Design a protein around this nucleic acid. Structure first.
Ligand code: DTP
Ligand code: DTP
Ligand code: MG
Ligand code: MG
Ligand code: MG
Lengths: 496, 496, 100
DNA sequence: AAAA
DNA sequence: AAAA
DNA sequence: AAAA
RNA sequence: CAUUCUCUCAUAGGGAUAACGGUGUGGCCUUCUACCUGUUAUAAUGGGUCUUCAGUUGUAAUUCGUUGCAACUGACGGGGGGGUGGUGUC
RNA sequence: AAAGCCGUUUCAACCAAGUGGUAACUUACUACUUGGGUUUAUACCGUGGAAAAGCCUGGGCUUUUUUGUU
């Protein structure tokens, strides 16, 4: 049977992926436990393996049980689907933290139902993605957030004065009227077979309004819901870029942007998804840095981790704070935190100008930021000496950043924080009875940290060079010109 | 080296494809020669195998020679490309027939140069197709003509009065200014690497104005050239669908369509591609069948094999004439033409109510339109009894035809032409000394042809049923619902 | 061309031919502003545009920006006061307002 | 090339 | 899934 | 009547 | 309640099975890359150097878009608090 | 009174509901042939071979048949 084989394949692939993820999780937990014991000494806590809680809620949640008997599950699912009696089991809903907006309700469906939703979402997207607007960049295999950022950046750079309009829907997934959805199935030349229609209605049967949160089919439903809005905005002549609920509209005319506001309001009244007054900034005017403005003005706007201005694209300030938090915590964890314990038993005290903890911290920062690339490799790629370079670091999630000044400031911050953390480590070592101020990592001044660390060599490689954002940014630009956003962020798989 | 391996693979694949095509050609020529001898008897001409003429022009044109030493060719090509001295060899330009506009100049590049052009076109399209307008349906792996026809049909059906503007570019490929092209390389956020840019310039070096005809890189350059025009038309708020030069713009407002005319005029003045007043129909007004119009009015429009009206989509009249020509010629060739020869020696004269030539003609007709599908298979698919049905016929090139009346007229035409051809065959047999008017195929009246032919059975199958357009149209509609147009017309992503 | 040979950009300052060159340079801008329907009055670089419609004045801003990008003469944000709304002495205004 |  |  |  | 295999009344229930899946490090192959310097009969191994961008200069091609080469110039590691000096202004 | 509608009979290969005029054509003219792998017999392109023939030279060229092809 054609359907049953497809369901078998999808369920088996999903279960095997989850099993591989779990095995990677526990293997890396063991490895990190070994490293932690080598770091924290006798104060290191014991290895603690956690199986996800919902695996005990039902056996079908467990990837191992599903992989045990997946043929039977697929057979029963196909039999129920072809009898028009199939109904997905109740998901496990948890209170995912959303302190920005209070709380958010996410749902983890059972493995068979999640697999069925993924399969039918793939089918529906495949046979209908040609009807989706090219400016909808959410939940697609042909559209990315980076395409949206590139489009916005290019269009903003073309002109000097642009009228913006930012709108976030209050509860986009949880307030779609089912009458509207059932009416949308026969519009825009959408090709939805009766089987897919029945499956969609099956996933909406438990609730009376809104679509489930955490299933693949809900992504296609969300994309399909905002088709009339996309068509209306396109026919108004405005440029927009919708990513799930986050909508940005920009045009060179005030009348067009007012009509866009009216169109979004009408669409919200038609679908019942009221806009969020707090998140939606309203209508603004994006000018240059010092151009006078007659209405509410802003010099830059934020869109999915990017702070876009007229001249350049830069990392969002909150994302910059996240990067700073991660790097600073790496330094604190590998340099300071072990020395704040009650006892230093089992810890290696730096001596003979060999601080392995500093080396570990620098290597982990490079792994976080570059991804493990030495400066030699990046320079070789830039010179054209080499043709292969892999981009998987924090920068691979912002390939389109062309703000060199922000990266310069970030590099200066990294160097300064490294110097200050080393000073605190030296102070703590002195307080613990070890004078090391004259040794290698601590005797360095802030100005000479990079210069001397570049020369330092271990095992025929320069593992001590302080990584820099500007170099990897140059590599990102060359990669983009040769590979293109897709391949560049292909490993990155931004997703989120 | 990465580049040389890629060139090797591309050249080998292209040469193997050409070799397979040639082997299929000569095998089917031999088979058709056997059938012809079984048809014309002693008057059948001898088998004549044609090798393409340009294979003798140069060895690199020959697929067999290229497959003989493709490693050396790829090595030399890579070496020349890295030295920035590579230059494609002169193509073989012939006079492809364009009686509608005189003649058309097409160029068949050598296999290595064609392979290089295909490879770099694939790369450029892959890393830049996200920048192409979603309404450019030519020379893409994500768009086809059927998506354009679906879009136009849906939008026309939405309203009742639409302002059209149909334009064609005169010698669009051969009049693009190279200055414009070289200026376009740094716009719209296009990602073209120096190697790709050098290759593009290499393919334009022989001429001074216009892009070559018959290479994939030409297709990419054509798509890239009309990006500013696409952006301007989108920002005007008009709906358009451009396929190569063919551009259909339709809007609900006269002012928007006049501005679209001005935009196309400005783009032509910028790129030097003038519009031929002959093929360009100007600005019209698409209304319903009997709605009064205040300006030049038309009830239907033609767009690439489809005659689109407000209410329904139908086959273009010229394409209908092509279908009629093919079917009528099949009947004439298998029924009448053998009997018009000087002698009937070696021919099987129908007897005992068994006209094999009629059976052969009916089977070939069914192969032409159905593709070999019996009515039982199509009815089984329609009922849902079966889930597999393949669409490879004349109607697989028009999956979006929803004009049932036109197909009804075509079916009536098929039945009537079959009856008249059978009458002429009976007359010729009588003139040749054989009375067969009382036998099976000839004694049938026009009304009873379909019924008795359906009742007729040979070898446990109904090979005599007269094929019908309506049945395959129902199958096509169900196939569109259960699978996106893409797959149904997938093997038919070519042209004319 | 002789009077422009010494330099590679811009026209010489303080000679008569530069006056005609400056007048000729801003001809496409003048035509565009006229065909927008806005009223304006240019005196060398100093330009004032006034219309009764906000859309026309926004289009005039865009036209001047396009002309500057075409000719390479950027506008200084300091001396350029931007778009305002000239009302009477005590008429309420919805956007940035000036009385003279 | 979506799960949460 | 692009030419000849 | 038109600038240094 | 093997996460292995198998059976079926098949999103559930039986059977026997001790392996099933996965991680870091290393070797082999395959990519893979500029220069300089250590050791051996010329190749491994060891230690170093540089790579980017912009402008100008001159040069060679260019199908006039541009490209190559050579030399110079410039850019190429944040901010905040306190003290202090010079410069700056009445 | 018509138009119209409903029959019934007859001519035609199609274009042709047409043309000044009416036939031809599919390796043509100007986009496709059976659900996917797995091997008995049939058989193809080109190249080998073995036979014959017909030319040049005194071995070479050309054409047919056979074989591997398969
Ligand atoms: N990382 C993620 N994992 C799972 N689902 C996600 C993730 N990010 C977003 N989503 C889903 C659930 C979110 O509700 C939806 C996007 O909506 P969101 O931007 O949160 O606004 P909202 O309209 O739901 O507002 P609110 O969160 O205040 O209710 O996409
Ligand atoms: N087989 C083809 N498929 C697609 N595009 C083609 C093909 N051959 C040529 N082209 C491109 C380049 C040509 O300019 C054009 C062919 O369309 P055509 O109707 O011949 O008009 P044209 O552009 O040649 O104008 P004109 O005949 O007035 O000079 O499209
Ligand atoms: Mg929202
Ligand atoms: Mg054309
Ligand atoms: Mg006739």
């Amino acid at each position: 049977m054609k359907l049953e084989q497809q369901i078998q394949r999808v369920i088996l692939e999903e279960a095997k992926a989850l099993i591989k993820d779990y095995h990677e999780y526990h293997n890396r937990v063991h490895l990190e436990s070994v490293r932690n014991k080598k770091r924290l000494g006798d104060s290191a806590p014991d290895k603690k393996i956690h199986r996800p809680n919902y695996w005990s809620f039902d056996k079908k949640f467990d990837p191992f049980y599903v992989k045990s008997n997946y043929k039977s599950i697929a057979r029963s699912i196909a039999n129920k689907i072809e009898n028009r009696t199939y109904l997905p089991n109740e998901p496990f809903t948890k209170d995912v933290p959303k302190p920005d907006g209070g709380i958010r309700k996410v749902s983890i469906y059972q493995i068979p139902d999640a697999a069925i939703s993924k399969l039918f979402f793939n089918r529906l997207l495949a046979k209908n993605r040609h009807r989706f607007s090219s400016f909808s960049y959410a939940y697609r295999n042909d559209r990315n957030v980076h395409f949206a950022i590139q489009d916005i950046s290019v269009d903003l750079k073309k002109n000097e004065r642009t009228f913006l309009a930012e709108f976030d829907f209050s509860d986009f997934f949880g307030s779609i009227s089912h009458s509207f959805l059932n009416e949308q199935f026969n519009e825009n030349g959408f090709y939805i077979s009766p089987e897919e229609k029945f499956i969609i209605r099956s996933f909406l049967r438990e609730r009376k309004v809104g679509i489930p949160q955490g299933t693949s089919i809900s992504l296609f439903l969300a994309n399909l819901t905002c088709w009339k809005l996309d068509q209306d905005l396109e026919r108004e002549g405005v440029k927009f870029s919708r990513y799930a609920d986050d909508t940005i509209i920009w045009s060179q005319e005030y009348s067009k942007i007012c009509n866009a506001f009216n169109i979004i309001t009408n669409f919200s009244k038609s679908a019942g998804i009221k806009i969020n007054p707090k998140k939606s900034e309203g209508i603004s005017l994006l000018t240059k840095k010092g151009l006078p403005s007659e209405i509410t003005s802003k010099n830059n706007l934020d869109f999915l981790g990017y702070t876009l201005s007229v001249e350049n694209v830069s990392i969002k300030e909150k994302s910059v704070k996240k990067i700073k938090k991660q790097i600073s915590y790496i330094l604190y964890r590998n340099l300071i935190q072990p020395l704040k314990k009650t006892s230093l038993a089992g810890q290696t005290i730096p001596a003979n100008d060999r601080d392995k903890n500093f080396l570990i911290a620098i290597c982990e920062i490079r792994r976080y930021m570059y991804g493990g690339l030495s400066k030699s490799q990046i320079k070789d790629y830039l010179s054209g000496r080499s043709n292969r370079l892999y981009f998987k670091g924090i920068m691979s999630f912002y390939p389109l950043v062309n703000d060199v000044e922000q990266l310069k400031q970030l590099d200066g911050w990294i160097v300064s924080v490294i110097y200050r953390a080393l000073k605190l480590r030296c102070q703590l070592l002195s307080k613990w009875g070890y004078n090391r101020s004259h040794n290698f990592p601590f005797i360095l001044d802030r100005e000479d940290i990079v210069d001397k660390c570049s020369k330092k060599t271990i095992a025929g490689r320069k593992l001590f060079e302080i990584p820099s954002f500007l170099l990897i940014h140059k590599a990102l630009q060359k990669g983009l010109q040769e590979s293109g956003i897709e391949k560049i962020m292909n490993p990155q798989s931004l997703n989120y």
